RNA sequence: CCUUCGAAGAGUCGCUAAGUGGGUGGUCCAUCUAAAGCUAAUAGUCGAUCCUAAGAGAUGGGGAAGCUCCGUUUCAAAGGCCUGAUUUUAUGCAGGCC
């Protein structure tokens, strides 16, 4: 498995409202409905990862 | 016009208060509302210049209505220097000496 990069990796102020704005937009990404039936939910990995990368 | 409400200056008045309270007058009555405020009518070379001596005298602080006085290192945060791969949740100075 890889090794791969946090998006924000900090507890300074700066670091903290990055973390802030990240899980802010986090919410509308990565949805799990908690059903049975749910989908499986797809992204785009090429952004995520030029994020992780 | 109708209806529902309706605060009031304390080390002050007189050691130290009150809220139909209180202040001042009159031979029970009369009159005002303090302890807050505004308002017109010929020298680098000789000396000084530098240094401190007895002493004087700022700052810190204190007294006095004040012009000013006391006190000279005193219960003053009274200033200089050095080191470092750039200082470990990521590039907002850390440590030491007198």
């Not at 990069?5 to 973390?19: A, D, P, W």
């Amino acid at each position: 498995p890889f090794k791969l990069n946090r998006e924000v990796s900090g507890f300074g102020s700066l670091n903290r409202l990055r973390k802030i704005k990240q899980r802010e937009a986090e919410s509308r990404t990565r949805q799990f409905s908690n059903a049975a039936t749910a989908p499986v939910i797809e992204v785009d990995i090429d952004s995520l990862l030029a994020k992780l990368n």
